[PDB]
């Protein structure tokens, strides 16, 4: 399918269409303002992925453990029996907590890499 | 602290707040022009980091040696007894020289990587 075709699919299946939605994210004064705001939004998301240490990746694994309080569902339950819309609602209240942890994790990684590189 | 809280701190301590200022870099016709110019500036800095081979990193080590003519201070003197404002003034006259060297270093690295990959 095309843009948002996987919206009703399970979380697992929809991960194979991540590039389709990505391509459609970027694709008289009020109209120009709208284009400028769309650009700023896109850049804010790219900057956020940069800060976390993901950069140009659509799937990015991290070192932040799952708290289990954010969601206590089984791994197969989440990936096989839920859509992304349901998941986004389910953990909306913890989004900023997760983002904060991701930023801190990358900062420690960068310092450790620098110190590892400093060894002769 | 928050945005620019580390401005008066030593160079070492301020490196732990690099993400805070980064987040605040992106955050009627004249106002729209101002937003467009802010976007162009941001992209120019990101392109420059890309050319140097750093991409999505806040701390990036390189292969360009320090000339010692640009600054002859001790490593601990620079990192423990100076702020970033003082440092920026101290080496302002050598900024373009350093940038040129960084670009050349990455170009050689890219060719060497390509030739290393070409080996069967």
């Amino acid at each position: 399918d095309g843009f948002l075709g996987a919206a009703g699919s399970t979380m697992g299946a929809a991960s194979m269409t991540l590039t389709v939605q990505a391509r459609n994210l970027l694709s008289g004064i009020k109209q120009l303002q709208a284009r400028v705001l769309a650009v700023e939004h896109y850049l804010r998301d790219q900057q956020l992925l940069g800060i976390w240490g993901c950069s140009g990746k659509l799937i990015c694994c991290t070192n932040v453990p799952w708290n289990s309080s954010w969601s206590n569902r089984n791994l197969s339950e989440i990936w096989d029996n839920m859509t992304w819309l349901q998941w986004d609602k389910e953990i909306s209240n913890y989004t900023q907590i997760i983002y904060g942890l991701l930023e801190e994790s990358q900062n420690q990684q960068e310092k450790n890499e620098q110190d590892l590189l400093a060894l002769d | 602290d928050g945005f620019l809280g580390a401005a008066g701190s030593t160079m070492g301590a301020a490196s732990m707040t690099l993400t805070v200022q980064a987040r605040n870099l992106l955050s009627g016709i004249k106002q729209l022009q101002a937003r467009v110019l802010a976007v162009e500036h941001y992209l120019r800095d990101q392109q420059l980091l890309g050319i140097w081979g750093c991409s999505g990193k806040l701390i990036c080590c390189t292969n360009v040696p320090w000339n010692s003519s640009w600054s002859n201070r001790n490593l601990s003197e620079i990192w423990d007894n100076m702020t970033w404002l003082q440092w920026d003034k101290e080496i302002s006259n050598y900024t373009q020289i350093i940038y040129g060297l960084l670009e050349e270093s990455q170009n050689q690295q890219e060719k060497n990587e390509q030739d290393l990959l070409a080996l069967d």
Epitope: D115 | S15, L75, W79
Partner: antibody
Framework: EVQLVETGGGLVQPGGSLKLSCRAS????????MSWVRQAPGKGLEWVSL????????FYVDSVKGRFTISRDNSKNTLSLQMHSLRDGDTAVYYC??????????????????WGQGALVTV | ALTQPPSVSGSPGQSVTISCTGT?????????VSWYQQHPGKAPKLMIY???QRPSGVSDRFSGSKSGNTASLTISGLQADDEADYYC???????????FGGGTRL
């Protein structure tokens, strides 16, 4: 002025475990890398383990890589080495020392700057 | 491990050299060959670091150098209280952090 005192256990049998902790004073603990060095009763010195100043990045000698854990608490000014298995060849006087590494923004060390008195671990 | 003479001695006041010999992957490649003095019953203390550097508080009679894969410590003006077990310690890179030599009984 600067002091390091090792505290730990005595006689351990093979297959057990023993935790050895070094207490530091007289300097900023969090500003220096720490390491452990051991001396067998009839031999010279050998390096055992190294931990950086933050404590997140550690290195070990291969002979103890799967047996010893090195950690530090910079708020408690405490360096701890938790040893497992403890073979007969591990009997030695263990010392904690300041030095052995520098976190990129500091001048190079690659030497052990300050040594404690040591504690004898007998298997 | 690094090779050191089992025993070194000389007359009081004489300049006595204790050598330490390694290989190209350690003493040769890296100019980080420290020296320690271990008095019997005491913990080692740092005497020399890097190649030619001396810690503050250390007498100027202790000095050294490096040539090829051989490092040496020279103690001028030998005193009765200088007889201790001396060790060399060389940086050997990231895979092997430090290598100590056998002790020399001065």
């Amino acid at each position: 002025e600067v002091q390091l005192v090792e505290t730990g256990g005595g006689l351990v049998q093979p297959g057990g475990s023993l935790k050895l902790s070094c207490r530091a004073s007289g300097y900023t603990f969090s500003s220096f890398a720490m390491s452990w060095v051991r001396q067998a009763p009839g031999k010279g010195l050998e390096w055992v383990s190294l931990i950086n100043d933050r404590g997140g990045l550690t290195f070990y000698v291969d002979s103890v890589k799967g047996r010893f854990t090195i950690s530090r608490d910079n708020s408690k000014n405490t360096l701890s080495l938790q040893m497992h298995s403890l073979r007969d060849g591990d009997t030695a006087v263990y010392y904690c020392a300041t030095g052995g590494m520098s976190s990129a923004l500091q001048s190079s060390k690659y030497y052990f700057d300050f040594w404690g008195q040591g504690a004898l671990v007998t298997v | 491990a690094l090779t050191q003479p089992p025993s070194v001695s000389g007359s009081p006041g004489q300049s006595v050299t204790i050598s330490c010999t390694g290989t190209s992957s350690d003493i040769g490649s890296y100019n980080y060959v420290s020296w320690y003095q271990q008095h019997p019953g005491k913990a080692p203390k740092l005497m020399i670091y890097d190649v030619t550097q001396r810690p503050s508080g250390v007498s100027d009679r202790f000095s050294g150098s490096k040539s090829g894969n051989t490092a040496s410590l020279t103690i001028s003006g030998l005193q009765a209280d200088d007889e201790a077990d001396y060790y060399c310690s060389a940086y050997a890179g990231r895979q092997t952090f430090y290598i100590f030599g056998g002790g020399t009984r001065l």
